[PDB]
């Protein structure tokens, strides 16, 4: 799209924010420049040991002096880090809060006409939340990291170059090799990740179809069949994961080998330089380490730059809306007002077209009149602007060509604080803000008194309902503690309209919630208002239009006829069509480890690699310490040989690192991939062996369960394998570091042992600061975003009942709270970070001072203090890296908390066939005992209560839908889709819950309400009903539905993608293949299903052939709300209130039972 200039992001600011940014920038610069100063001081102190091991007293003096300097640097870093973190966090929060406040103010003031619910409501709210979060991300703290790391870069180059020369050059020239190796590793990792993502996308599109059409999958046994394709796909993904692990192991090995070569070359050339006499033993350390930390500085700064660019794009997207100038302007200085209005609404040559798209015509020559103190009814046959008149009287749309007068006063010169204040409006499903009930009433009146609130609500059919709450007019509709979310939501909008007492009362089609007696209660409340008021009626259905004293009907751009409710019905003038159209109507980890038992050989090699890496670490530390000690030798001839085998040791260590990392990562990747494949197979097998009622909930569709297998199945293997590897490696390294430490010197190692918690804590804080101290900022702004969304989503309601100022107070309060939270969090984080850094530097100074003093009392030398110190510092760094994994393991109970839940979530039916006696042949004895059933998703359904029916062999049934009185539940209880609440089901003289389900399901087939095809070419979509037949009977059964000519025309013969990424077929073709499957399987019991007019097959010919071919020797059950093509030659029934009300064949039900079945005849008649 487009972006904004970056320094235009800091527009909504203040003097205080300028000061905060200044302080934060100064702190960041000081911090960054301070770290290489620490390197310089350490180099000088090491030189102080090195050049003074004959002048013992001077050693003590200089070591104490530089320990004091370390303390000073610790103090400076403390204060600087506190300053940068606190100032930047607080400034970012203040500015983003100001931006949110400005943004929400614009929407309310900006005109309402452009909000046409054409996905605009969902766009704006997500824009607000997510994009304000993005802007805050790009402003608050990442600028601090950017400045800090760029400052470390600039200070790092300067310090080495002024230190001596020629090594800040070599190291800076070499570090591009490390950078390129890391970049190549990242590129390969991204490529292999994309390939694995594609492979699992194929696997998921193969799998998720079974879950969605579970009823078809269960009916036609495919549990073994479905799992084989998943097995093949997951084996492909397993091979790809093996390759991925191999590649990442090689990448780590190669990058560490290149690092070892770099260190070897740098140390060798340094040792060359000291030999000549151009550099001491302390300057080289400073130069090398300064250059390397500069390299990491560039890495972090580049990451920050990417984040900044993304934030810039988001910020432009936000700032697009604010500056949009509106059309209608409310202004006391220009807009005037009147008094004692009369409601004489008149339209004079009103023409308008939608500004978004004016190609269509809406109100071409629109001219209607609204009387005063009366009621009018505007109704249209379709979307011809019947719902637009309310969007035109309300000043929602300016008439681009025309004039409208109010009692002789034209309305374009009236402010939107007086005209709208005299009008009351109700809309479709009036949304209620997440506040108390008493707040909703206050929309109609800000604050006058309380007695009128109770008086007006009395005549609103809600005074009794509000009393059914153990609170003082307090109810939080947001937090669903008390769930008053029934279908008949409380009509508090009527009460809030009553409180305002508007002269004008616009109406809307507020009946779209499956109107019933509950929706018929509100008719009296609606009829109680139109007394002495200039009100209208806008309706879509004429069921409740029976009481109107004047009805005007518009058809195309203009009104056709007017009059009362006496002549509109008569003369059949453009009104008979409307009524006719109306009439057509915690041992989990051990269990996981046990589940990985067969893959134990790989675990041993993985562990071996772990110990080998643990030995890699301290080896590097010891060799570096030896080089540091060697630099101070006096015999230059001896230095060459020692540096020679030290360089060879570096080369050997590089090769060793390559090999060890290869072994460890490869074998642990193999183990992890095998474990995740096994758990995926087990989880899918468990899921397919579940109850249908488990899929009925809104969280167990094909879009969530199939998504859990994506992220949860990989997280478990990641957790187990990676945590085991890292813990083993670092634990071995730590043990090696102490064992080498406590042998070379046992006194100095005790102080470092004592101060070790401080060092590990400080390094932990340093590594934690890289990802920011903010934390779940989306959750902090969880109520402001909700208030903004509710204010924007129902802005149509907010336009009336003028409340453009009351929302801002709530927004201000709920913005004030997170400002305090951010203030406290920022100050605490700054203080703790400063204390941790001060502790680190003070501890290091104390360690070195005590070491130097211990050297003085002739029981040590310049060989053991330095070695133990550097080894223990590096192993403290490694242990700090280890500790950071603890939050990852702890993180939300890392995703094996539900992986192992569904894996052992026992079902209700439990179709398991452990020892139940199997069935060889079913002859047909379908009989229903006393059975009641309720939907597990909604227990409030009591459609079934003591149902009873009997079906004999070799016949059919024609159970009508009966206005959807549980029509789609008899088919779900012939087979074990649902468990009856009470009673049993007897089939073939035996209980249903005593026999294997597979045998009963493989000889009974159904016809689904919505036929569907699997995600494959059309060769098994016809043969899915029977396994064993390949080409013999498929063609024979293909001539059951007249679609052979349809399949004759196809490029690739029979094969064609229809599920996805291929040709798309019509609705009438899927049922042909479904009937083909039904006739190919050749079952004993058949089930038919037609409902909700979902056939969508004009000129019905496929059904007639099927009903005369599939009934030869198959028992079928027919259900259809339509009273057509359901001539059951055996029996027909009607289901009412969970029991049979009449039984018999079709002939016995036509003319014999004058009664409820007559409803059926008159129904078919109206329909025709
Ligand atoms: C003078 C030092 C001994 C100093 C006391 C010490 O605290 C120092 O800050 C340590 C923690 C740093 C300084 C330089 C760092 C190294 C510099 O960068 C490197 O070459 C990489 C290579 C690789 O990434 C290793 O895993 C870490 C490793 C090898 C770094 C590991 C930690 C250090 C060794």
From Swiss-Prot:
GO molecular function annotation: ABC-type transporter activity; ATP binding; ATP hydrolysis activity; auxin efflux transmembrane transporter activity
Tissue: Ubiquitous, mostly in shoot meristems. Present in the majority of stem cells, predominantly in a non-polar manner. Accumulates in seedlings roots and hypocotyls, and in roots apices and inflorescences.
Catalyses which reaction(s): (indol-3-yl)acetate(in) + ATP + H2O = (indol-3-yl)acetate(out) + ADP + phosphate + H(+); brassinolide(in) + ATP + H2O = brassinolide(out) + ADP + phosphate + H(+); 24-epi-brassinolide(in) + ATP + H2O = 24-epi-brassinolide(out) + ADP + phosphate + H(+); 24-epi-castasterone(in) + ATP + H2O = 24-epi-castasterone(out) + ADP + phosphate + H(+)
Transmembrane segments: 22-42, 68-88, 143-163, 167-187, 254-274, 288-308, 604-624, 648-668, 738-758, 830-850, 865-885
PROSITE patterns referenced in this protein's UniProt entry, alphabetically: ABC_TM1F (PS50929), ABC_TRANSPORTER_1 (PS00211), ABC_TRANSPORTER_2 (PS50893)
SS bonds (residue pairs): none
Cellular compartment(s): Cell membrane
SUPFAM superfamilies membership: ABC transporter transmembrane region, P-loop containing nucleoside triphosphate hydrolases
Induction section of the entry: By auxin (IAA). Induced by red light, but repressed by far-red light. Induced by brassinosteroids (at protein level).
Regulation: Transport capacity is stimulated by the chaperone protein FKBP42/TWD1. ATPase activity is specifically activated by bioactive brassinosteroids in a dose-dependent manner, including brassinolide (BL), 24-epiBL and 24-epicastasterone (24-epiCS). Inhibited by vanadate.
Span of domain ABC transporter: 345-581, 926-1162
Biological processes, Gene Ontology terms: acropetal auxin transport; anthocyanin accumulation in tissues in response to UV light; auxin export across the plasma membrane; auxin polar transport; auxin transport; auxin-activated signaling pathway; basipetal auxin transport; formation of plant organ boundary
Topology versus the membrane: Multi-pass membrane protein
A GO CC annotation given for this chain: cytosol
Region annotation (Interaction with FKBP42/TWD1) ranges: 881-1168
Binding site for brassinolide: 256, 263
Similarity remark: Belongs to the ABC transporter superfamily. ABCB family. Multidrug resistance exporter (TC 3.A.1.201) subfamily.
Described purpose of this protein according to its UniProt entry: Brassinosteroid exporter that, in conjunction with ABCB1, supports the accumulation of exogenous brassinosteroids (BR) in the apoplast, thus promoting BR signaling initiation involving the specific receptor BRI1 and required for plant growth and stress responses. Mediates the transport of castasterone (CSA) and brassinolide (BL) across the plasma membrane. Auxin efflux transporter that acts as a negative regulator of light signaling to promote hypocotyl elongation by mediating leaf tip to petiole auxin flux.
Designated name of the protein: ABC transporter B family member 19
């Amino acid at each position: 799209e487009q972006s904004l200039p970056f320094f235009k992001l800091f527009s909504f600011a203040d003097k205080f924010d300028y000061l905060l940014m200044f302080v934060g920038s100064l702190g960041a610069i000081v911090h960054g420049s301070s770290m290489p100063v620490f390197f310089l001081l350490f180099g000088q102190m090491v030189n102080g040991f090195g050049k003074n091991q004959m002048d013992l007293h001077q050693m003590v003096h200089e070591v104490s002096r530089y320990s004091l300097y370390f303390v000073y640097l610790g103090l400076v870093v403390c204060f600087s880090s506190y300053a940068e973190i606190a100032c930047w966090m607080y400034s970012g929060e203040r500015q983003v809060a100001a931006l949110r406040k400005k943004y929400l103010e614009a929407v309310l003031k900006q005109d309402v006409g452009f909000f046409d619910t054409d996905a605009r409501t969902g766009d704006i709210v997500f824009s607000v939340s997510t994009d304000t979060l993005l802007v805050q991300d790009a402003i608050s703290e990442k600028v601090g990291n950017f400045i800090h790391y760029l400052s470390t870069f600039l200070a790092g180059l300067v310090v080495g170059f002024v230190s001596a020369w020629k090594l800040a050059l070599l190291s800076v020239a070499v570090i591009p090799g490390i950078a390129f190796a890391g970049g190549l590793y990242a590129y390969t990792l991204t490529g292999i990740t994309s390939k694995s993502r594609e492979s699992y996308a194929n696997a998921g599109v193969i799998a998720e179809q079974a879950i969605a059409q579970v009823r078809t999958v269960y009916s036609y046994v495919g549990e073994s069949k479905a799992l084989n394709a998943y097995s093949d796909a997951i084996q492909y993904t397993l091979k790809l994961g093996y390759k991925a692990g191999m590649a990442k192991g090689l990448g780590l090995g190669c990058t560490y080998g290149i690092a070892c070569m770099s260190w070897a070359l740098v140390f060798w050339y340094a040792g060359v330089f000291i030999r000549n006499g151009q550099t001491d033993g302390g300057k080289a350390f400073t130069a090398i380490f300064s250059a390397i930390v500069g390299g990491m500085s560039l890495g972090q700064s580049f990451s920050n730059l990417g984040a900044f660019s993304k934030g810039k794009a988001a910020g432009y997207k936000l700032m697009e809306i604010i500056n949009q100038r509106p059309t209608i302007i409310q202004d006391p200085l220009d807009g005037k007002c009147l008094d004692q209005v009369h409601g004489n609404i008149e339209f004079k040559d009103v023409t308008f077209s939608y500004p978004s798209r004016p190609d269509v015509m809406i109100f071409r020559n629109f001219n209607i009149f609204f009387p005063s103190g009366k009621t009018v009814a505007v109704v249209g046959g379709s979307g011809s602007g019947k719902s637009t008149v309310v969007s035109l009287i309300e000043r929602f749309y300016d008439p681009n060509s025309g004039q409208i007068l109010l009692d002789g006063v034209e309305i374009k010169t009236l402010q939107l604080k007086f005209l709208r204040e005299q009008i009351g409006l109700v809309n479709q499903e009036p949304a209620l803000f997440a506040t108390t009930i008493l707040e909703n009433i206050l929309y109609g009146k800000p604050d006058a008194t309380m007695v009128e609130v109770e008086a007006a609500a009395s005549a609103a059919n809600a005074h009794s309902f509000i009393t059914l709450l153990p609170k003082g007019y307090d109810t939080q509709v947001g937090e669903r503690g008390v769930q008053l979310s029934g279908g008949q939501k409380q009509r508090i909008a009527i009460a809030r309209a009553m409180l305002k007492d508007p002269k004008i009362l616009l109406l809307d089609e507020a009946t779209s919630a499956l109107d019933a007696s509950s929706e018929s209660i509100v008719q009296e409340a609606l009829d109680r208002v139109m007394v002495g008021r200039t009100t209208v009626v806008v309706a879509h259905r004429l069921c409740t239009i029976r009481n109107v004293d004047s009805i005007a009907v518009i058809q195309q751009g203009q009104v056709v006829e007017t009059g009362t409710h006496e002549e509109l019905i008569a003369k059949s003038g453009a009104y008979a069509s409307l009524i006719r159209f109306q009439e057509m109507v915690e041992n989990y980890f051990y269990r996981l480890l046990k589940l990985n038992s067969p893959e134990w050989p790989y675990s041993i090699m993985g562990a071996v690699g772990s110990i080998l890496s643990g030995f890699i670490g301290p080896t590097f530390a010891i060799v570096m310490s030896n080089m540091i000690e060697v630099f101070y030798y006096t015999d230059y001839d001896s230095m060459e040989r020692k540096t020679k085998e030290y360089v060879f040791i570096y080369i050997g260590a590089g090769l060793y690192a390559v090999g060890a990392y290869l072994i460890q990562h490869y074998f642990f990747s193999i183990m992890g991939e095998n474990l995740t494949t096994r758990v995926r197979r087990m989880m899918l097998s468990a899921i397919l062996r579940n109850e249908v009622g488990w899929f009925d909930e809104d969280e167990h569709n094909s879009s969530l369960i199939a998504a859990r297998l994506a992220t949860d199945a990989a997280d478990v293997k990641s957790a187990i394998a990676e945590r085991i590897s890292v813990i083993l490696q670092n634990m071995t390294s730590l043990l090696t570091s102490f064992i080498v430490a406590f042998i070379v010197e046992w006194r100095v190692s005790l102080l470092i042992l004592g101060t070790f918690p401080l060092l590990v804590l400080a390094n932990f804080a340093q590594q934690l600061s890289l990802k920011g101290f903010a934390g779940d900022t989306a959750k902090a702004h969880a109520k402001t975003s909700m208030i903004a969304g509710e204010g924007v989503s129902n802005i149509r309601t907010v336009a009336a009942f003028n409340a453009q100022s009351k929302i801002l107070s709530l927004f201000c309060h709920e913005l004030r709270v997170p400002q305090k939270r951010s203030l406290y969090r920022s100050q605490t984080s700054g203080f703790l970070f400063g204390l941790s850094q001060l502790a680190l530097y003070g501890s290091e100074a104390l360690i070195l001072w005590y070491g130097a003093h211990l050297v003085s009392k002739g029981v040590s030398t310049f060989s053991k203090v330095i070695k133990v110190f550097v080894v223990l510092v590096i192993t403290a760094n490694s242990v700090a890296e280890t500790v950071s994994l603890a939050p990852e393991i702890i993180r939300g109970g890392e995703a094996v908390g539900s992986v192992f839940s569904v894996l052992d979530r026992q079902t209700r039916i439990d179709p398991d066939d452990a020892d139940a006696d199997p069935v060889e042949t079913i002859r047909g004895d379908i009989e229903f005992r006393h059975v009641d059933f309720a939907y597990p998703s909604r227990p409030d359904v009591m459609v079934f209560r003591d149902f009873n029916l009997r079906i004999r062999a070799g016949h059919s049934q024609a159970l009508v839908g009966a206005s959807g009185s549980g029509k789609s539940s008899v088919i779900a209880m012939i087979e074990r889709f649902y468990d009856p609440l009470a009673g049993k089901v007897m089939i073939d003289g035996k209980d249903i819950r005593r026999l294997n389900l597979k045998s009963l399901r493989l000889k009974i087939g159904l016809v689904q309400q919505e036929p569907a095809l699997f995600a494959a070419t059309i060769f098994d979509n016809i043969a899915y009903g029977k396994d064993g037949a390949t080409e013999s009977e498929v063609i024979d059964a293909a001539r059951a539905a007249n679609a052979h000519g349809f399949i004759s025309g196809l490029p690739e013969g029979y094969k064609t993608p229809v599920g996805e990424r291929g040709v798309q077929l019509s609705g009438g073709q899927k049922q042909r293949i479904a009937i083909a499957r039904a006739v190919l399987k050749n079952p004993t019991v058949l089930l038919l299903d037609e409902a909700t007019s979902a056939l969508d097959a004009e000129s019905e010919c496929v059904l007639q052939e099927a009903l005369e071919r599939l009934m030869r020797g198959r028992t079928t059950v027919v259900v259809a709300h339509r009273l057509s093509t359901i001539r059951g030659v055996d029996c027909i029934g009607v289901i009412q209130d969970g029991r049979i009300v009449e039984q018999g064949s079709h002939s016995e039900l036509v003319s014999r039972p004058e009664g409820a079945y007559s409803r059926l005849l008159q129904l078919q008649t109206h329909r025709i």
